[PDB]
Amino acid sequence: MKVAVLPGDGIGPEVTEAALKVLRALDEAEGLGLAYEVFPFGGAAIDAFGEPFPEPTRKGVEEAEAVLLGSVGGPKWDGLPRKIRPETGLLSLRKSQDLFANLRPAKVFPGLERLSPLKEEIARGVDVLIVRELTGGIYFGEPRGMSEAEAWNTERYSKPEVERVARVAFEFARKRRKHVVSVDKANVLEVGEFWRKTVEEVGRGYPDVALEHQYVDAMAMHLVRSPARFDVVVTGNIFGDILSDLASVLPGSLGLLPSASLGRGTPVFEPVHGSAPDIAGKGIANPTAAILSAAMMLEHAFGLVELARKVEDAVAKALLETPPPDLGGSAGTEAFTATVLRHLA
Amino acid sequence: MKVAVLPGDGIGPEVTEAALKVLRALDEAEGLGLAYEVFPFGGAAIDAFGEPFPEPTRKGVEEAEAVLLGSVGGPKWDGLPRKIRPETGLLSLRKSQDLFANLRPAKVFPGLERLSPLKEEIARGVDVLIVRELTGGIYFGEPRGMSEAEAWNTERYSKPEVERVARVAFEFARKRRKHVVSVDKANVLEVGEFWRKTVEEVGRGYPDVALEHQYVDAMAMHLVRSPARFDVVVTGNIFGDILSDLASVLPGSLGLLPSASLGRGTPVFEPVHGSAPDIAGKGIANPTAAILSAAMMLEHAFGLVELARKVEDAVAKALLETPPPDLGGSAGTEAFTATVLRHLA
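Structure tokens for the assembled complex are given below, as produced in the milestone run.
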């Protein structure tokens, strides 16, 4: 399994390293045949190649079978022209591999219900997966613009854009609890009706999966009032953005949230958290997101479901035994990772 | 105090009557000079005049000082062409009175924190007012449409539309805790930039009101993790739909919330809930939303602030003492209104 490791900036490096200590342990123990290489990306890349996604890195991604990314961004590279800012490096990553679906899990691990803003009974059992469409939507729709008197943007979606993202959703519900909820606004917008219809059409190919539709505004409050009944949620670009962030507040911390951007090319797995530059190098960063992103990589990129689960349970044990500083504990990056490993052997 | 009452369909008449019992009781006790007439609206008017907003109803709203609306809609008329559908009666009512701002209050009454899905700590003391732009945005933006391979909608906003709603937001901020949060998508959408710009500008005339900006995806997180820090939230049509629906979870249920539509003409006060046609006539419908709409009317249309507060508390006591069926209890419309009435003495 050839992995391209793009640590990035800030705490990216130390958390990505934490994940790597887990991968190697797993590798040594069962001979998975792991081969990974670290490439410059984001600010680290700018500081040497003048661009956030240099050619060596670009190739490293194409060659690998999966990408384990860390974090990007930092005040240093915030004065630079947009075309070379760390953030743009990520867009270039996505567009090169044509990643169109952004998987954003939200799971409340047993024992951690106390972290959620919801009462324990409601949080208990949450394990939703928001699948957002990245490439199209009002974020990219033409025409658009503004003058002194008015502004306008266009929410546009084509049949093929909606189909390929719907496929990823049905595909994942199958690995999960066979349930999919398509979120749209078919009661007012044409795009809503076109989205709903297209999802229903793709849905026929997965008779084993229960499909349901919901209006974005209705889904918003549903995710907060009873998120335990949802498995896979699939929606458009802008709606998925709102709903993903909404789902992320459920577990009770961003350090616990991993993610994956799937598409045509190399899968990209990376923690949701930012680069947190002022705590970088201090050794207190919570490696959970990165470790969990490694688990998603094992399962989804390498089909090692059983192995991905082990990592997931070890991490859960660790969170309870030695919670990191952001969970109210004292376990820095190293000590926390040690506890995880102490559950993988 | 000349009120125009438009009961509407389903439970509308049921809930509106519970509301009128309260208004009449306050009238006799305080000598308000209450005068009201009921008018056909929605399916009820369709059946009679073949139109959801007949001429006699229109003149009635124009001569009143405020409108108390019940519910609208029902499958009996759903098969009719949009142009005559009950839901259109609402649009015609809003346009005729040039209503451009929808006020959706999300408040957690002391003692009822228990009803919230959120931890008592975070739901405690919440009192947010979402001021949504009614006439405009993507819902009514041109061009729009769909083909067999694509669909599109247009989010367009002009300077006046924004100024009008913004002005109302700051104004309410003043009568409240003097803090407005403008919700947009400025970091990616021209309309967000345009909205923000225009709001910041209008904000110049209100130096005593604290303005703040937030992206809709960020607000979705904030309203769940720390909703109590907000006062007034002014935003666009669709964003307001989502944010309002979400804010409904804080108090507990969506059927306990009232709304108001302000503009240049006669203000409309109506419960956020639907007509629930299947429980129509069976009693059981919770009139809380209808009574609170009547409370909003007294406060915002007639300035009897102290009286609005008085009925808010009466329903709070009642929700706590004799909970309606949808709140897990068994107090039907009649029995519930009685309790409310008891605490009104």
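The longest helix of chain B spans residues 12-30. Residues 1-345 of chain B form a domain with the Isopropylmalate Dehydrogenase fold (CATH 3.40.718.10). Further analysis is deferred to the final report.
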